[model samples]
Target chain A: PIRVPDELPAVNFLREENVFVMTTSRASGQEIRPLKVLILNLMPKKIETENQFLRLLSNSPLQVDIQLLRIDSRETPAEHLNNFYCNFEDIQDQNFDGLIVTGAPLGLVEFNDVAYWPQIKQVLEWSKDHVTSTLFVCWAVQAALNILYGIPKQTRTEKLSGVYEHHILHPHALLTRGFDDSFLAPHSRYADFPAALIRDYTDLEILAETEEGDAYLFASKDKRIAFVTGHPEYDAQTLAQEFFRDVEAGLDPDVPYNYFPHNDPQNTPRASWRSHGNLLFTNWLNYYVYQI
Target chain B: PIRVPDELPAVNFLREENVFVMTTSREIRPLKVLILNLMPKKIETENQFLRLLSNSPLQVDIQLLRIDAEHLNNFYCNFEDIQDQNFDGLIVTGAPLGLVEFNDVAYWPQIKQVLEWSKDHVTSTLFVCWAVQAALNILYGIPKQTRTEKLSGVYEHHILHPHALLTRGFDDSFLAPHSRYADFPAALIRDYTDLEILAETEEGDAYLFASKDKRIAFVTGHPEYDAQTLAQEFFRDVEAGLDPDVPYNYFPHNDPQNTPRASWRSHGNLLFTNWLNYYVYQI
Candidate 1:
């Protein structure tokens, strides 16, 4: 029988909205077990990030049991560490069905110079043996590709920010199922590897790419390792929030294109990206995790 | 355990296209059933309808059900035996749910006749409450009104039919729960009194009026029932100090707002579409 916990913490409005509830009684005859997913939370806002990932995973048909993993060497604030997170050494023996390594803010530095570089490398190598698949996002993608495939990261003169349109290079791939011919994704980074350099590695297949910006997605032939250059899990207002935060800090960020109405900062942004965001995560869950 | 028959017929589709399938193993988990409908069948279409409804109950989520009964006898074929067609969507329509009044409301007499005509009736009922009532008024002169002793505020009507396919000529009415007066004679209903009135309260509440369409539908309820409408009604009645009857089988937690809209729309859409595909299309 598939066992679901009776009560979860009242974290968001989803509970009040009665988002979705799968009871143990309903799962009595279900043959599939819950998928154990371990997320290495390198993002600064741990709970917010957890909520983002959980919102996607929870909406999927497959039941996901999520565990948070952290590095012991680097000291995170006590406020960020709670009973929910586990250190790398604590869960090294256990194998996970899927792993997600989120991007941290430390993008300017080289792979070896980061404070928890050794532990990060260990987690990446450990994933090859202990996990069915690993999803690396943004800086984590750069870090993992460099460590695994010797793909070097190049610094961009301007911070690539905003909602940009990208074409699907592999439409038939399971990851791109139900996606339009072209989709919009939000990219926020000061550095990215060149597509030509990425294409040099035969093992990597570019799933989707933008004409002007960096390649949006690429994956290994076996699909055990997937890299997303942009954040598909960003909420509709996330780019606006980032822009405003930068402006408040006197960074004077460039205006994001096709984001605000008539490029006006005062205009409310449209939630057009929600459907695609949902489709991407749902497809990932359906194809990578549930199909197994 | 939910049992999906091995002999379940394969849906004809182009090769490589994904067809929805429920394995007998997974079918036993629970069923989210729906009804489908196709236009132009009229009332003679009830028997094929009943067969489609029975097939969906084998899934897990569904155990108890409900159906609305109204406006189905006088206009349809073979009004006498319409009652034999009363069954749930799972047991009737393959997948579709909402039906337009102009197309399907003509069959309402047969639907109303089936309530007493059939021994096995459904639990909850859904009416495409608005279209049919509007059609009833337009075709048969049923007078519906929206006057109440409430704050009268001047409202402006916009000709925003710029893109809307429906609601091109919709009249203003107080939006209430499962109730509406079609702007026609009460005598029209009294004359055709064979149809039992399930609910009628304020105008615009019964936006999706549904009733039995001679073994096909039980008229007088909205098939596409919005979740918040009932809560809104209860709050309104409480403020009005009118002792409205406590709505039956609602508010599982006794708190008004907690009940999940519970996604009847998907099931309704699926049911209506499946009915059209299975009965009308295949036929």
Candidate 2:
């Protein structure tokens, strides 16, 4: 059982993970009823992000029916959105087995100023009782931390971008399991969520932290919500593309740290985070979502 | 879903991986994996192998295969009794007889017979550590070479074939733990037509070699080792006054008290999971 060969977004993630994804149906050919997972795609370039989330979702024995949800979508074609995605209103009445909120490109603006902030807030509020487990990534993590606890994101002068080493604080935590004592992950944010303030909330436990003052990963006490500060779903060339894009725009962003061969932008970045990245999702799905 | 007990090899590995191991112990007709644990610390070796095998959700019925020996432990199943029974997979762990001649060992004929039987009956057979040397020697006529001193510690391995299913999901170069006093000639293996090399290391030489669509994988390292395994061996040797050289790249600053990190665990998980999916499940 391996990846779906088609070009569609739904199957692409599962396809990449080597899960057997036939054109569209997991309706049959399983011992137990498949898991129903809901994804609220808050990021732009919806298909790429959708594929990233889906790749991790498909990496297990547990069968999952993916539900991709989006908020405002004027840029993406209506027909494309109609086929694979559902709005917040469409799935609010139904219960989900799992919910994941991906990061968006809205960190520069005030949270209240974002067009879909109210709607996203509503979904977050509804998730407390409706969803079994939810993952908040990158900007979504800042948003959730801001919303859940009274933490504020501080803007930085330069973007903290590149691959950095992280120390595993808790070796036995489910999310950080099978991980090396020190691991490398990519971080590209223009803000700090304040690692020190995280201790104020006893509900959260820090799993890993970067040497450069980033509280890389953490989780809740109940195992319901997981917060990741980096883009583990990033394809090998994501930061490379972002760097080139910034250079093209005359922004002069520094090359991502520890990413390239000689820290030169000429070399292609290696995919160092994928093993633990997939494992993180695998353990989350197995221990928190499916096992429940 | 894998092995028994609640110790470090099982407990720590399981707890870290967030696996819900067999609590009350339920039975399902799972893949019958015959594990030939020939290591010195029987229970420790059993725990280590089972730690990797148990990570996957598949129900595994682990049957420990014991060779003809003087001091046999409990749950010892005779190899001849199950010669007719079908096994989904077979795993041969390391034995401490790497320094001795194969003919000099007490259980030479038994190792030969089981390997001969694996060619026809078993779906896939895994040989680890000295067993890799044994399998390479007995089945393929590739003689094992001896070193003046012991070669032990965690070593980095370079994958030969990128498309090999056994190394699927593995990084470009991964670490594998090795402890041995013997070496197998990679030159001889490369010349052999049936034997295909999967992974190799400069320090450890040839690590993993496969034959006939991965029906057998000769792995000369311990991927399932605990952080303290090498340290325990170091202490044991020091107490016995064998003056064993400390395993390479194991302890910090060559101090045995410092614990080794689990750098190879993800690769180890990848190795086992891929083997289970590609070899066992495919079979």
Restricting to chain A, the TM-score for each candidate equals 0.84, 0.85
Query: Residue A131, candidate 1: how far off, in angstroms?
Result: 1.2
In candidate 2 chain A, where is summed lDDT lowest over 10 consecutive residues? A1-10
- Tell me, by TM-score, which candidate is best: 2
Model 1, range A1-292, lDDT digits (tens) per residue?
Answer: 1122233121122223322233334434334566678889888766557655654454333445667787754555564464556888888899877888987776678766788888888999999989887888888988887789777767787888888888777634656543455667778887675666787763588778877746677777676887788877775677788789989999988887678889989888754444355555655664565442
Q: Judged by DockQ cut-offs, is candidate 1 incorrect, acceptable, medium or high?
A: incorrect
Cα lDDT tens digits, model 2, A65-178, are 667787775565566577667787788788877888988777678877888878877988999988888888888888888778767766767777887788788755667756
In terms of lDDT, the poorest run of 10 residues in model 1 chain A is A1-10
Candidate 1 lDDT over B1-283, as tens digits, reads 0012222222111011222322233412333322223222322233222222222212223221222222232222233333344433332221121323434645455344332333245333332434344334443455434324321111122111211111111112111223333332233453653333322324322222223342222223322344444555567778899766545434555556566342222222223333332222211
Clashes per candidate, residues 3 or more apart or on different chains: 95, 4
Error of 2 at B270 (Å): 2.6
Model 1, which residues run further than 4 Å from truth? A1-30, A193-196, B1-283
TM-score, every prediction:
0.53, 0.83
lDDT over C-alpha atoms for residue B14 of model 1: 8
Q: List-wise, what DockQ does each model earn?
A: 0.04, 0.10
Candidate 2 per-residue lDDT over residues B72-113, each given as its tens digit: 443557987799898889998888887789879999899999
